[PDB]
């Protein structure tokens, strides 16, 4: 009943009164409830069709914020409704005005009035935030936004000139990070700009002493992946993820225990969390360098070199430290995510026989440190998380796929992972149980302690004897682990455990059981597990013959 008469004014033919109302609705649309009523009376329709194209720049700044605020307070869909109403054109036209104001030499920007200047920033802030929101909405909106050259060139102009207020600067980087995430066109836009040289400006800033260096790394990493500027195919001046890693690592160097918060702290969301998340993405995306490299002293792999020598030491430090506070509870978590992604990618390499020897010597000692300094301390205090339990087992599984029973036996870790499996009993292959099977299986290969092998082997086989309630994926992993371990009659454990404890009978007994559960899996929902299980029974049959043939 207060807002009803406010809106009438917005359509008033007296520019003074409309422009005032706009002012008030931008505040009033903040509190909930006043916003439900404001949206039902056609606020979005007026603002779009009248207020954003009004002649007065105070009116247009309120218009944009009314949309900004609404976009923020509303659910994600509200943006699609905005997209459909063609807000993007409104934004593009307004964007083209900011640039004309910013890049004009007639009036010209620095010679504007203080209050006049502040208004151009208001409008930019509303624009920036909006673009950010719609790009997050759906893939089509993302590719509609990225299409708009005016929008892009606005972004390059802001990042490049560095005259904008910092809150505007950071929002512009944020935007371009989202726009550039797995988007080829944007990456080409950034690297093809001879007008403002955003790419050069970004490089210089991502490499130097500036406080916002990591922020520029987040943009550049996205560009390097999208354009496949990688170790096999370096970008401009040998550019690839390699050059971002030291900056990203010097960012972890500064975070030390006992200083969570301050009176003035402009770096914490950006400075620390961003660096970790990006290191972990770098971990993920290096996997694509290995695949693409193949279709065509880690000197040839600088990204991998930097990851191991520089990135990983700081991540083991960060994984270790408390944890005094919830915020450092998140630093640990993210540190563990990066270790995880790197360790996993690396373990996606063939190291059997002599294969990839160069990379195996680079990694192996580090893999041992990760296990002793990270995985083991954390495993020492049983309680209490499931989320965290799950994170350490994933990493342990990645590190033990390379270590292969060379992996340290210290706190008898296999027994802990084994107890983890059973107790956490209370996409098939992402089960934590699968993870328990795979790590314990991997550290039990030769040349491990023959009793460590006996336990692990007994657990794996028990799994089959009592397959009555084990999830089919966990059966497949168990069978692969066993084949992986006891398929060599020269290994002490083949005679010392496989034969000594007659593993062969359980395997021969399990064959029928294994055929019915396989056919129990819908090929059509879902394929992978089915075809994977078919290979395990296949291998299971071939495995029961080969030994059958050996005392």
């Amino acid at each position: 009943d207060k807002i009803l008469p406010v809106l009438k004014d917005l359509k008033s033919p007296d520019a003074k009164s409309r422009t005032t109302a706009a002012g008030a609705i931008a505040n009033i649309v903040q509190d909930a409830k006043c916003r439900k009523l404001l949206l039902r009376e056609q606020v979005v329709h007026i603002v779009l069709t009248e207020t954003l194209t009004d002649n007065n720049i105070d009116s247009r700044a309120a218009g944009w914020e009314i949309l900004k605020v609404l976009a923020q307070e509303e659910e994600a869909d509200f943006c699609v409704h905005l997209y459909r109403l063609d807000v993007l054109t409104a934004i593009e036209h307004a964007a083209k005005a900011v640039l004309e104001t910013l890049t004009t030499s007639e009036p010209p920007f620095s010679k504007l009035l203080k209050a006049q200047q502040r208004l151009v920033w208001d409008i930019t802030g509303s624009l920036l935030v909006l673009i950010g929101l719609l790009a997050l909405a759906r893939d089509e909106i993302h590719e509609a936004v990225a299409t708009k050259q005016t929008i892009l060139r606005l972004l390059f102009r802001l990042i490049s000139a560095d005259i904008a207020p910092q809150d505007i600067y950071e929002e512009a980087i944020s935007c371009l990070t989202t726009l550039s995430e797995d988007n080829l066109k944007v990456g080409q836009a950034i690297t093809d700009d001879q007008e403002t040289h955003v790419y050069d400006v970004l490089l210089k800033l991502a490499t130097g002493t500036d406080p916002r260096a990591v922020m520029a790394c987040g943009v550049l990493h996205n560009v390097f992946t999208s354009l496949q500027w990688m170790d096999h195919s370096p970008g401009k001046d040998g550019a690839c993820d390699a050059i971002l890693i030291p900056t990203l690592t010097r960012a972890l160097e500064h975070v030390v225990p006992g200083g969570a918060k301050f009176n003035g702290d402009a770096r914490y969301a950006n400075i620390t969390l961003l660096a970790l998340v990006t290191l972990a993405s770098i971990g993920t995306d290096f996997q694509e360098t290995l695949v693409k490299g193949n279709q065509g002293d880690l000197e040839d792999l600088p990204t991998l070199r930097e990851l191991i020598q520089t990135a990983v030491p700081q991540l083991i430090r960060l994984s270790n430290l408390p944890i005094d506070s919830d915020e450092s509870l998140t630093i640990q978590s993210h540190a563990l995510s990066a270790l995880n992604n790197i360790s996993w990618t690396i373990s996606c390499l063939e190291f059997a026989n002599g294969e990839n020897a160069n990379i195996h010597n680079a990694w192996y000692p580090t893999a041992k440190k990760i296990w002793r300094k990270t995985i083991l301390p954390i495993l020492e205090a049983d309680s209490a998380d499931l989320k965290l339990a799950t994170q350490v087992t994933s990493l342990a599984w990645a590190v033990a796929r390379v270590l292969h029973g060379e992996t340290p036996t210290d706190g008898n870790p296999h027994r802990k992972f084994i107890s983890l499996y059973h107790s956490s009993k209370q996409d098939p292959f992402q089960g934590l149980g699968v993870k328990c099977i795979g790590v314990v299986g991997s550290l039990a290969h030769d040349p491990a302690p023959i009793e460590v092998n006996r336990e692990v082997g007994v657990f794996l086989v028990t799994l089959l004897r009592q397959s009555n309630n084990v999830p089919p994926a966990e059966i497949v992993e168990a069978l692969n682990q066993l084949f992986d371990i006891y398929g060599d009659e020269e290994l002490a454990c083949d005679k010392e455990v496989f034969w000594k404890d007659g593993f062969l009978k359980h395997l021969e007994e399990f064959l029928p059981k294994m055929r019915t559960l396989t056919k129990g899996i819908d090929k059509r929902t879902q394929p992978e597990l089915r075809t994977r299980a078919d290979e395990a029974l296949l291998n299971l049959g071939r495995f029961v013959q080969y030994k059958k043939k050996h005392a």
């Binding site: 290995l290 193949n294 040839d300 373990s347 996606c348 390499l349 990645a398």
Partner: peptide, 19 residues
Amino acid sequence: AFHKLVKNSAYYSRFQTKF
């Protein structure tokens, strides 16, 4: 530039944590 991968590498891309 050729580095031999594991037999079923894509099976393991699920263990990457994304952002």
